[PDB]
Each structure stands twice: as structure tokens, then as C-alpha cells.
């Protein structure tokens, strides 16, 4: 902990399906929301998850 913040510690907040036990994913890409093709833009409901 640090005053002003300590931001080393991220976490996935958005994914596709339910992850199975005891594997991981470091596939840092865009996130896609709906029926729009964003696929690596942002702003209009795209993300970094």
C-alpha cells in the first residue's frame, strides 16, 4: 500500500466464458462489446480488460 496509490496489481475484469481450473491467460488484447465491429478501437464501448 502507498499513499497516492500503488498500481502494480491489476486484474482481469472482463472475459469471454468461464475459465477452467488452474490455467491462466495473459492475452492482453482489446475487448469487444456487442454486434459492432470495433476489434481494437476504443471509446465506443471497446475496452482493455
Amino acid at each position: 500500500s502507498k499513499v497516492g496509490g500503488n498500481y502494480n496489481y491489476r486484474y482481469r475484469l472482463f472475459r469471454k466464458s468461464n475459465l477452467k481450473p488452474f490455467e491462466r491467460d495473459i492475452s492482453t488484447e482489446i475487448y469487444q462489446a456487442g454486434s459492432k465491429p470495433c476489434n481494437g478501437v476504443e471509446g465506443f464501448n471497446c475496452y482493455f480488460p
Partner: antibody
Amino acid sequence: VQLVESGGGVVQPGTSLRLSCAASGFSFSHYVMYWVRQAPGKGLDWVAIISFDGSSQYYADSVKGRFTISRDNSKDTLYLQMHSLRPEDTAVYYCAIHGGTYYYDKNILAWGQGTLVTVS
Amino acid sequence: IRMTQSPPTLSLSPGERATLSCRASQSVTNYLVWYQQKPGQAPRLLIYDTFNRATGIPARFSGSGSGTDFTLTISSLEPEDFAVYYCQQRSNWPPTFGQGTKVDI
């Protein structure tokens, strides 16, 4: 555990004063310390905190900007460095221990015995 | 996150039992400590973390309570144990002490 504080007396409104807190017994590093004032005829209220090395110091109201707390475990003491004071924070001051940094740190708490500062 | 001690001064004789309540502005768990400050002394701590008192404090001092409401109980102290009492939290930064409750006769 033991705590001995020093740097009390009478000053003028607009001088400085070395507020020092010496610790022994328990290991002075791995441990979070802080200060607490009490104006005579009041309750209890805190001053400033330091986190086991100088990377993060939090402050209270109306003492931010006149108070620079620093610790140094290579000479195992604590400082407030009251600086350019007011004629209204005449009080008694105590250095106390918040406690704990790792999992094996066995949190115990202890207090000093007071340091009196007065103004003119 | 501000503490408060709502019972004011009391007039319990050397005997009987006393029960002192401390609240909190939000959820604090097993993080309180009690202090008993005489007229003009250092505030001596009483109770580690809501349940176990420290060394040199007898068994008639007991500390309990949970959630956001905490209680210190004197079973049958003695003919002196009249001072002011404080509840302090060590959840986060920094440790707020509250208001305080005296006792008289």
C-alpha cells in the same frame, strides 16, 4: 519495549523545535509509527504517520505544511520537526506504534509518556 | 470513519458493573483498543483487538462486541478505577480515538 521522547519547552509563535522519539527493545524497522497531541483539557487526536521508510507520509488537518515527519532506521529514531509554529498547538505529544509490516511481525502496541510544548 | 462514545458521565459506586459502548462510522472488525486515562497520566492501553487484554490488566476488565458496536465491561473493579476511557481503531489510517466517557460517583 521502550519509547523515550524529547524536545519540549517554551517557544515563540514562529520558531522551530526538534521533536525526537527514540525507540529500543523491539526492532524499530518493520514497524509503523505516528504522533498524537493532546491540548490540556481535551481528549486525544493524532498528527502524522510514517510508513517504515520514507515513501508515504499522511498528515492531519492544519498541520500539513508546518510538519515534516521522518524516520531513519540506521539511527533508530523518529522526528516531527515542528517548524514555524502557531500559538495554539501548545500541547503534549506522544509517539506511538501502529504496528506490523510482514506476516511474522506479531503486532504489539506501546505508547510513550509525553513531551510538553508551550508557546508565548 | 469517526468513532463516538455516546454514554456520558456515570455515577457507579466502587461496586456494581459498568458497560461502555463504542460505535463506528463503518464496518470495523476486531481492531479496537481501550485506553484508561487518569487525571494527568499517560493513557494506559487495556485490550488487544476486541477480545484479549494486555499484561498487567486483571480479569474484571472484559472487552467484547462486534460488527460496528463494541463494549467494555467492568465486572467489579475496585475503589479507584474511575477515569476517562477511549476506544481506538487500527483498521486503516489513521487511528481515531473518539470522544471519551468519564465516570464519577
